[PDB]
Curated annotation (Swiss-Prot):
GO terms for molecular function: ATP binding; hydrolase activity. It catalyses: ATP + H2O = ADP + phosphate + H(+). This is Actin-5C. It is an enzyme of class 3 (hydrolase). Keywords: Acetylation, ATP-binding, Cytoplasm, Cytoskeleton, Hydrolase, Methylation, Nucleotide-binding, Oxidation. It comes from the Eukaryota. In Drosophila there are 6 closely related actin genes. Its EC number is 3.6.4.-. One of its GO terms (biological process) is sperm individualization. Its main location: cytoplasm. The keyword ATP-binding applies. Interacts with Rab6. PANTHER family: ACTIN.
Length: 360
């Protein structure tokens, strides 16, 4: 029988069967409750009568009651399976606190009675999906961006960096600057419309200053978008100013290095003898890395920071929106992985802290 692959994020949850090339269910990480409980799409649609919670903040689980409700929904409503029948691979953020790993483990075995489980780092799974075991991954989702150096299958914790600027922040920023053109997007249902605008029309400029000058001298960069009621709006320099905040956190009032400088800073924290492997194997993952033009801009910026003789290669896989899930599916499918699982007998004997020596 097949193992199950579950990838829980700040914005979206992805789940399915080990061996498939895509997840079977993708839904919002939202739990709703009367002002008895609703999860996912139903919670968002019925949001008028409900109080909404987001159990995962910047990649870290903060509310365990609600996280359990998401897992019950994932098994019984979305995949339509019995947890006690299947081994279960779960995913976690880089630098997930020790206590969080243990509680995760406790709930699978004691609440859902899984015969087996395992937990792997999100960024490591993405690297695997690209057929590599050495490289540095930039993972940018809905709530957090990480840069993660990896060597022979092992993430290097001393060199991992965290930036709390991602897709959710970009959506809000686009709402703001579209107003300064005369439009008025402010409500929760309007936020969802602007999220669509962002995903369809936005892009990363190669040279920001020059792109600003092009937009100010003609309408060559303008694009249109039709709203539900038939109104057509027009967007110009907003198309590239929005994702520019990833490269300049100043735009949002943050005193922080951009995603290009963060990647270089992580590499510089690693042993001199491995840096060249990392420079030549920089991989992009997550929904927020989907912008057209993002790989060429990363290439340009890293080149200006690195030594002049250095070989720079940015890899941006076409399926990178789901490369965490696909990496898990690959791993849980390998017959040479089957003796890596934590069994329930092992749990019964050692308890939740067995996870530190089994999932290393
Ligand atoms: N084509 C696209 N262009 C730009 N942004 C996109 C695109 N598709 C999705 N996104 C954005 O990516 C985000 C979702 O990505 P992902 O599922 O990787 O994050 P997550 O796992 O929910 O969150 P995190 O990893 O931060 O915990 C959303 O903010 C969404 O608006
Ligand atoms: Ca994620």
């Amino acid at each position: 029988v097949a193992a199950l692959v579950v990838d829980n994020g700040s914005g979206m949850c992805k789940a399915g069967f080990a061996g498939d090339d895509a997840p079977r269910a993708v839904f919002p990480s939202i739990v709703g409750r009367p002002r008895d409980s609703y999860v996912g799409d139903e919670a968002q649609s019925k949001r008028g009568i409900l109080t909404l919670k987001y159990p995962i903040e910047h990649g870290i689980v903060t509310n365990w009651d609600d996280m359990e409700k998401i897992w019950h929904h994932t098994f019984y409503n979305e995949l339509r399976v019995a947890p006690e029948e299947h081994p279960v691979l779960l995913t976690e953020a880089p630098l997930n606190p020790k206590a969080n790993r243990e509680k995760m483990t406790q709930i699978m075995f004691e609440t859902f009675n899984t015969p087996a489980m395992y937990v792997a780092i999100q960024a490591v799974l993405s690297l695997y999906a690209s057929g590599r075991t050495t490289g540095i991954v930039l993972d940018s989702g809905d709530g957090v961006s990480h840069t993660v150096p990896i060597y022979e299958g092992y993430a290097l914790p001393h060199a991992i960096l965290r930036l709390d600027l991602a897709g959710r922040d970009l959506t809000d920023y686009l709402m703001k600057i579209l107003t300064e053109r005369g439009y008025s997007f402010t409500t929760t249902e309007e936020r969802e419309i602007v999220r669509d605008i962002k995903e369809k029309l936005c892009y990363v400029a190669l040279d920001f200053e020059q792109e600003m000058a092009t937009a100010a001298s003609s309408s060559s960069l303008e694009k249109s978008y039709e709203l539900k009621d038939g109104q057509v709006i027009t967007i110009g320099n907003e198309r590239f100013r929005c994702p520019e905040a990833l490269f300049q956190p100043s735009f949002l009032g943050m005193e922080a290095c951009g995603i290009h400088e963060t990647t270089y800073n992580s590499i510089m924290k690693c042993d001199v003898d491995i840096r060249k492997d990392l420079y030549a194997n920089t991989v992009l993952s997550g929904g927020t890395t989907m912008y057209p033009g993002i790989a060429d801009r990363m290439q340009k910026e890293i080149t200006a920071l690195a030594p002049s003789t250095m070989k720079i290669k940015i890899i941006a896989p076409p399926e990178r929106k789901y490369s965490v899930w696909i990496g898990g599916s690959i791993l849980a499918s390998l017959s040479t992985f089957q003796q890596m699982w934590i069994s329930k007998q092992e749990y019964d004997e050692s308890g939740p802290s067995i996870v530190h020596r089994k999932c290393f």
